Design an enzyme around this catalytic site. Structure first.
Site, PDB file in Angstrom:
ATOM      1  N   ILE A 247       8.405 -11.936  48.063  1.00 30.81           N
ATOM      2  CA  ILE A 247       7.007 -12.154  47.727  1.00 30.81           C
ATOM      3  C   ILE A 247       6.327 -13.011  48.796  1.00 30.81           C
ATOM      4  O   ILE A 247       5.135 -13.290  48.685  1.00 30.81           O
ATOM      5  CB  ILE A 247       6.861 -12.771  46.322  1.00 30.81           C
ATOM      6  CG1 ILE A 247       7.497 -14.166  46.221  1.00 30.81           C
ATOM      7  CG2 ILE A 247       7.414 -11.821  45.258  1.00 30.81           C
ATOM      8  CD1 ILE A 247       7.148 -14.918  44.948  1.00 30.81           C
TER       9      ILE A 247
ATOM     10  N   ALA B  54       8.147 -20.061  58.115  1.00 30.46           N
ATOM     11  CA  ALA B  54       9.021 -20.640  59.121  1.00 30.46           C
ATOM     12  C   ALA B  54      10.220 -21.287  58.433  1.00 30.46           C
ATOM     13  O   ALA B  54      10.044 -22.128  57.554  1.00 30.46           O
ATOM     14  CB  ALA B  54       8.259 -21.644  59.955  1.00 30.46           C
ATOM     15  N   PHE B  55      11.423 -20.859  58.836  1.00 33.19           N
ATOM     16  CA  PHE B  55      12.682 -21.448  58.397  1.00 33.19           C
ATOM     17  C   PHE B  55      13.140 -20.849  57.066  1.00 33.19           C
ATOM     18  O   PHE B  55      14.009 -21.425  56.421  1.00 33.19           O
ATOM     19  CB  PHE B  55      12.641 -22.975  58.238  1.00 33.19           C
ATOM     20  CG  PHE B  55      12.278 -23.776  59.481  1.00 33.19           C
ATOM     21  CD1 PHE B  55      12.736 -23.397  60.739  1.00 33.19           C
ATOM     22  CD2 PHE B  55      11.492 -24.920  59.384  1.00 33.19           C
ATOM     23  CE1 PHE B  55      12.410 -24.137  61.864  1.00 33.19           C
ATOM     24  CE2 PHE B  55      11.168 -25.657  60.514  1.00 33.19           C
ATOM     25  CZ  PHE B  55      11.626 -25.264  61.751  1.00 33.19           C
ATOM     26  N   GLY B  56      12.591 -19.700  56.653  1.00 33.56           N
ATOM     27  CA  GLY B  56      13.076 -19.042  55.449  1.00 33.56           C
ATOM     28  C   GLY B  56      12.018 -18.170  54.777  1.00 33.56           C
ATOM     29  O   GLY B  56      10.980 -17.874  55.364  1.00 33.56           O
TER      30      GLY B  56
ATOM     31  N   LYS C 158      13.222 -19.838  46.727  1.00 36.75           N
ATOM     32  CA  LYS C 158      12.925 -20.121  48.120  1.00 36.75           C
ATOM     33  C   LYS C 158      14.225 -20.393  48.871  1.00 36.75           C
ATOM     34  O   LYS C 158      15.005 -21.246  48.456  1.00 36.75           O
ATOM     35  CB  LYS C 158      11.990 -21.334  48.196  1.00 36.75           C
ATOM     36  CG  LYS C 158      11.592 -21.787  49.595  1.00 36.75           C
ATOM     37  CD  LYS C 158      10.561 -22.910  49.604  1.00 36.75           C
ATOM     38  CE  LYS C 158      10.065 -23.241  50.978  1.00 36.75           C
ATOM     39  NZ  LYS C 158       9.068 -24.315  50.966  1.00 36.75           N
TER      40      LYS C 158
ATOM     41  N   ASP D 113      -2.869 -31.234  54.491  1.00 34.66           N
ATOM     42  CA  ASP D 113      -3.196 -29.840  54.746  1.00 34.66           C
ATOM     43  C   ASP D 113      -3.132 -29.070  53.427  1.00 34.66           C
ATOM     44  O   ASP D 113      -2.387 -28.100  53.301  1.00 34.66           O
ATOM     45  CB  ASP D 113      -2.316 -29.266  55.848  1.00 34.66           C
ATOM     46  CG  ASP D 113      -2.811 -27.984  56.507  1.00 34.66           C
ATOM     47  OD1 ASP D 113      -3.932 -27.539  56.179  1.00 34.66           O
ATOM     48  OD2 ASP D 113      -2.068 -27.439  57.350  1.00 34.66           O
TER      49      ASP D 113
ATOM     50  N   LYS E  68      -4.171 -26.459  51.431  1.00 34.66           N
ATOM     51  CA  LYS E  68      -4.784 -25.207  51.840  1.00 34.66           C
ATOM     52  C   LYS E  68      -4.842 -24.264  50.640  1.00 34.66           C
ATOM     53  O   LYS E  68      -4.083 -24.436  49.689  1.00 34.66           O
ATOM     54  CB  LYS E  68      -3.959 -24.658  53.012  1.00 34.66           C
ATOM     55  CG  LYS E  68      -4.649 -23.601  53.863  1.00 34.66           C
ATOM     56  CD  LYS E  68      -4.058 -23.381  55.250  1.00 34.66           C
ATOM     57  CE  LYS E  68      -4.909 -22.455  56.068  1.00 34.66           C
ATOM     58  NZ  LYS E  68      -4.493 -22.414  57.472  1.00 34.66           N
TER      59      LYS E  68
ATOM     60  N   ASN F 153      -1.469 -22.902  49.426  1.00 36.11           N
ATOM     61  CA  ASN F 153      -0.609 -23.642  48.512  1.00 36.11           C
ATOM     62  C   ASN F 153      -0.940 -23.322  47.056  1.00 36.11           C
ATOM     63  O   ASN F 153      -0.055 -23.338  46.205  1.00 36.11           O
ATOM     64  CB  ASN F 153      -0.745 -25.153  48.677  1.00 36.11           C
ATOM     65  CG  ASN F 153      -0.472 -25.627  50.085  1.00 36.11           C
ATOM     66  OD1 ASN F 153      -1.300 -26.338  50.667  1.00 36.11           O
ATOM     67  ND2 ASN F 153       0.680 -25.276  50.638  1.00 36.11           N
TER      68      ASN F 153
END
Lengths: 383, 383
Positions: free
Chosen positions: A79, A83-85, A102, A195, A197, A200
């Site tokens: 979904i 970055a990193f996963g 996650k 941040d 946003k 989120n």
């Protein structure tokens, strides 16, 4: 300098208290991280290691089967990525329950020397225990991946919402309010999000909002601020307290109504000159109530609204409506209630591709590398 | 292949069950053993280690203060020494209770490549839970010493008894019986003691016997024997089952009455020729009941008494007395009841010198040595 009785009691509390880093779930990680980072024919020449490993090998092999593992969850769909996963819609094989899981590549985190970012996300999601924050139920490690099992938010982010709708003020009033409450909850814990946003902000089944993906989060100092050295950067940070966060909400509100970022690489200079770059469109049918609030947020840190308290913001007439009041806010009907058929419906979510990639691994070491060591204490169970 | 509910239950049992090696007390040892064997300026150059250590440093420093430590016990006197450590009469500072605390130099154990001997002693003393075995209450590790806190036996061993008394048969009948029961208790657990010496046999306050110092102990096989390759060695071992132990009791009994070992470096040849070297003194006022029993033990493994069961031994008329019966044995009066003034009286014990020695340490390593790793899982608390 205490009595044996009281000392022995407090040890049992430190092994139970889920917030403790010596939680009995945290300690098994420390043992597993040894076996992972020692079971190498090169290192097993050392006798002490050879024997220790041999003794616990049959034990830990049993423990891995019983503790929560990746094989318990079947992957429905991806979904989202980052970055990193990545993040996956999952179903627990036994309990038959949908969650959002996650992942975080251990290799990539180590490769680029970046490990201590998840800690703050974990602390918040687990313990926040509010209706404005996406809750973490289970968290568990692996040979090569960190996992975070958290509730599925099937309504998607607001980025897709705003893109698929002409957002009226009535909606902007609501989604702003639910952010303002969410963000105060995090402040009450003693953390300052950065941040903040539309990326989120996720939507639950009812259509109401919950925050997530808590990167760039740090703990508030003893004063109530943070001493640290893109368009959501306030002059405060660019030249850092709770004011930092209120700036990114004023941005958010401007985006919903104007349909572009306020301060359009030299953008940093427009942020500094906040006094002489606050422009609105030609046909600003945007009410004066909104233009007032947006300007109240987007101004210098000293005068920026919220410095005194969150209660200032709630007084603002921009929120003064008939439908709801702050306490009844989450109980009312939402502007957009996602109508989904199945309980695995990802219609609001984007359709990304599946992994389809050979996973990279560490080179087998000749000395103690300790690559699993920074991840010790991550695991968490919610009873 | 189980249900989440039942899996999660069994994990909590493995973290509570005191016999488990993943006991929550066992896991803290594994963390402490890391910090001990990583906190070296040379190894702390590695980043992963540097950060892991930093994170847990303030934690583990607090844990060391609260867990049981050497500083809780003040040293009264040294009641014995041996290879790889010593034993001390101690008093708990807080509770004000006397115990006997056995130390074991970590350096000497590592130096001479000998670590896995205490395990069996720990298993027995803690869990035996009988009135014939010296019980272990607490056990805890250190930077450089293993500790075993166990009940003080103020009557001393039988070595000093026999030397300070002309032992009559009436006494030999008793002390033999209390051994025979003690040794059966250990057999019921599924362990086979070796070299059962008067050195091991200690006396409680009442004057009754309890066994201790369980070296050369191994677990019984699935058959009920042991496949392993000084004067207490049977022909069985010299050419190993439960018969092994009954031989060393027949020796014991011979020593009390004759006042010398039976088979006097070529002694091994006298043990093999057990048929043509069973001599008694000239004035053997030793009764025929004793001479019968001693010969029944000291014979070839096939015919040696006890092969069928312990109940054979109890039938023997050598034990048939008026004063006591086997069940009432420990309830009767003892031949030698130690009359002690203070609760710290070591009159029965020998007076050895205090440590008065600079403790040797390991050289500070440049790579992961793992010297503390073989001692992980030793600690034990008895509620």
């Amino acid at each position: 300098h205490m009595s044996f009785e009281t000392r022995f009691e407090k040890m049992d509390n430190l092994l139970r208290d889920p917030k403790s880093e010596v939680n009995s779930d945290c300690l098994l990680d420390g043992l597993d991280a040894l076996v992972y980072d020692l079971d190498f024919p090169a290192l097993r020449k050392n006798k002490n290691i050879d024997n220790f490993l041999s003794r616990y090998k049959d034990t830990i092999n049993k423990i891995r089967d019983l503790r929560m593992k990746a094989e318990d969850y079947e992957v429905v769909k991806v979904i989202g990525r980052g970055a990193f996963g990545e993040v996956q819609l999952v179903r627990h094989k036994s309990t038959r329950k949908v969650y959002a899981m996650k992942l975080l590549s251990k290799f990539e985190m180590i490769k680029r020397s970046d490990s201590a970012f998840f800690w703050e996300e974990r602390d918040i999601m687990a313990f926040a225990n509010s209706p404005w924050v996406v809750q973490l139920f289970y968290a568990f490690q692996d040979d090569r991946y960190l996992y975070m099992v958290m509730e599925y938010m099937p309504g998607g982010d607001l980025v897709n919402l705003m893109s698929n709708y002409d957002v009226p003020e009535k909606w902007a009033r609501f989604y702003t309010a639910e952010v303002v409450l969410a963000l105060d909850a995090i402040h009450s814990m003693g953390f300052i999000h950065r941040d903040v946003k539309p990326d989120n902000m996720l939507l639950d089944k009812s259509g109401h909002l919950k925050l997530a993906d808590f990167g760039t989060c740090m703990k508030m100092n003893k004063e109530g601020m943070v001493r640290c050295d893109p368009d959501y950067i306030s002059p405060e940070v660019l030249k850092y307290g709770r004011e930092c966060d209120w700036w990114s909400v004023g941005v958010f509100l401007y985006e919903m109504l104007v349909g572009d970022t306020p301060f359009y690489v030299g953008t940093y200079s427009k942020i500094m000159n906040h006094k002489n770059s606050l422009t609105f469109p030609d046909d600003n049918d945007i009410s004066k109530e909104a233009k007032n609030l947006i300007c109240a947020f987007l101004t210098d840190r000293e005068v920026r609204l919220g410095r005194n308290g969150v209660e200032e913001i709630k007084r603002h007439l921009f929120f003064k409506n008939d439908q709801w009041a702050w306490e009844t806010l989450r109980d009312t009907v939402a502007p957009v209630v996602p109508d989904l058929s199945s309980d695995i419906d990802t219609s609001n979510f984007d359709d990304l591709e599946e992994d389809k990639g050979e996973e990279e691994t560490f080179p087998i070491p000749k000395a103690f590398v300790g690559n699993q060591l920074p991840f010790v204490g991550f695991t968490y169970y919610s009873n």
